[PDB]
Scaffold this active site. Structure first.
Site, mmCIF file in Angstrom:
data_model
loop_
_atom_site.group_PDB
_atom_site.id
_atom_site.type_symbol
_atom_site.label_atom_id
_atom_site.label_comp_id
_atom_site.label_asym_id
_atom_site.label_seq_id
_atom_site.Cartn_x
_atom_site.Cartn_y
_atom_site.Cartn_z
ATOM 1 N N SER A 10 22.496 -10.205 20.017
ATOM 2 C CA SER A 10 21.122 -9.438 19.630
ATOM 3 C C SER A 10 20.490 -8.616 20.663
ATOM 4 O O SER A 10 19.508 -8.089 20.295
ATOM 5 C CB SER A 10 20.176 -10.324 19.180
ATOM 6 N N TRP A 44 22.444 -14.564 21.308
ATOM 7 C CA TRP A 44 23.137 -15.680 21.150
ATOM 8 C C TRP A 44 24.288 -15.385 20.380
ATOM 9 O O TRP A 44 24.407 -15.005 19.108
ATOM 10 C CB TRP A 44 22.276 -16.859 20.522
HETATM 11 C C1 LIG Z 1 23.669 -17.296 17.177
HETATM 12 C C2 LIG Z 1 24.343 -16.450 16.383
HETATM 13 O O1 LIG Z 1 25.702 -16.887 15.900
HETATM 14 N N1 LIG Z 1 26.296 -16.213 15.147
HETATM 15 C C3 LIG Z 1 25.574 -15.067 14.762
HETATM 16 C C4 LIG Z 1 26.222 -13.853 13.946
HETATM 17 C C5 LIG Z 1 25.294 -13.708 12.904
HETATM 18 C C6 LIG Z 1 25.816 -12.711 11.777
HETATM 19 C C7 LIG Z 1 27.484 -12.317 11.801
HETATM 20 C C8 LIG Z 1 28.072 -12.800 13.009
HETATM 21 C C9 LIG Z 1 27.375 -13.591 13.952
HETATM 22 C C10 LIG Z 1 24.253 -15.171 15.735
HETATM 23 C C11 LIG Z 1 23.287 -14.326 15.667
HETATM 24 O O2 LIG Z 1 22.791 -14.165 14.438
HETATM 25 N N2 LIG Z 1 22.840 -13.968 16.724
HETATM 26 C C12 LIG Z 1 21.626 -13.053 16.635
HETATM 27 C C13 LIG Z 1 21.631 -12.394 17.995
HETATM 28 O O3 LIG Z 1 21.880 -12.889 19.399
HETATM 29 C C14 LIG Z 1 20.265 -13.730 16.445
HETATM 30 N N3 LIG Z 1 19.539 -14.144 17.896
HETATM 31 C C15 LIG Z 1 19.451 -15.709 17.558
HETATM 32 C C16 LIG Z 1 18.241 -15.786 18.738
HETATM 33 O O4 LIG Z 1 17.826 -14.627 19.475
HETATM 34 O O5 LIG Z 1 17.793 -16.944 19.085
HETATM 35 C C17 LIG Z 1 19.283 -16.220 16.338
HETATM 36 C C18 LIG Z 1 19.681 -17.753 16.750
HETATM 37 C C19 LIG Z 1 17.635 -15.987 16.369
HETATM 38 S S1 LIG Z 1 20.419 -15.268 15.608
#
Ligand SMILES: Cc1onc(-c2ccccc2)c1C(=O)N[C@H](C=O)[C@@H]1N[C@@H](C(=O)O)C(C)(C)S1
Length: 245
Positions: free
Chosen positions: A51, A191
């Site tokens: 993210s 993450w």
């Molecule tokens: C973990 C995580 O694990 N797998 C995916 C994913 C999702 C969709 C498709 C393919 C993989 C995912 C995710 O969504 N990661 C995001 C970005 O880093 C979000 N940031 C986190 C935060 O910043 O804490 C959230 C735990 C809030 S989520």
């Protein structure tokens, strides 16, 4: 203060040791990059941005008129991985919540072709987004090193990315996560996918009272039952240890 650099190095390595993970935190003062933590060789290895990409996703969508900053992205009513995502929100709210579905909608608006060429122009990480416009930051093939991430944050903090000034300012307002004694901390967390352990990120900068900007990128492993806020905690202790906040 008068604290030796050996002691600073040891203090910050202990924050990673205590969390029982392996990670690095890269800080940049002016032109000088310093690598702290308990796994210094992470600094130039490649990881999916997760993210943290939301930052560039926003810059691109706004520059190319795929959204505005006041525009509301409707929840479509499907059950989401987290209840906090089951609401209508702006890009900015979506940055704070890390609302994957909103950033996915934005990426689809922009489209593969336009996304690929914006990521080249900006030369972010290995610059490769493959064929799936809506998950290439989460599952690959896009990858980036912690050095590249702190340089990205350093560009955006000083308005050097190749986007209008107003686009950059718009995305920077979205990234404010904390204020500590006149200092402000701008940042985005990440993450990664998969079974534990996964990659964790916190990438941003501190804007000091005098206007100085000090970018950072934390990169570590997310172990079984670690809360997300460990990234923040390790980061805040490190910046405080070094007197940056
Ligand atoms: C973990 C995580 O694990 N797998 C995916 C994913 C999702 C969709 C498709 C393919 C993989 C995912 C995710 O969504 N990661 C995001 C970005 O880093 C979000 N940031 C986190 C935060 O910043 O804490 C959230 C735990 C809030 S989520």
């Amino acid at each position: 203060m008068h604290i030796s650099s050996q002691q600073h190095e040891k203090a910050i390595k202990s924050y990673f040791d205590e969390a029982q993970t392996q990670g690095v935190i890269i800080i940049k003062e002016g032109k000088n990059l310093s690598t702290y933590g308990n796994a210094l060789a992470r600094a130039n290895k490649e990881y999916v941005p997760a993210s943290t990409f939301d930052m560039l996703n926003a810059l691109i969508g706004l520059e190319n008129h795929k959204a505005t900053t006041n525009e509301i992205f409707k929840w479509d009513g499907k059950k989401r991985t987290y209840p906090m995502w089951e609401k209508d929100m702006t890009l900015g709210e979506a940055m704070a919540l890390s609302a994957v579905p909103v950033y996915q909608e934005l990426a689809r608006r922009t489209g593969l072709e336009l996304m690929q060429k914006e990521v080249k122009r900006v030369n972010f990480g290995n610059t490769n987004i493959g064929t799936q416009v809506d998950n290439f930051w989460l599952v690959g093939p896009l990858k980036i090193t912690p050095v590249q991430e702190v340089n990205f944050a350093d560009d955006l903090a000083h308005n050097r990315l190749p986007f209008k000034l107003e686009t950059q300012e718009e995305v920077k307002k979205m990234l404010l996560i904390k204020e500590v004694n006149g200092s402000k901390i701008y940042a985005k967390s990440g993450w990664g996918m998969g079974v534990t352990p996964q990659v964790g990120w916190l990438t941003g900068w501190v804007e000091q009272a005098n206007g100085k900007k000090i970018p950072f990128s934390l990169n570590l492993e997310m172990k079984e039952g670690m809360s997300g806020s460990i990234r923040n905690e390790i980061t805040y202790k490190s910046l405080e240890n070094l007197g940056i906040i």
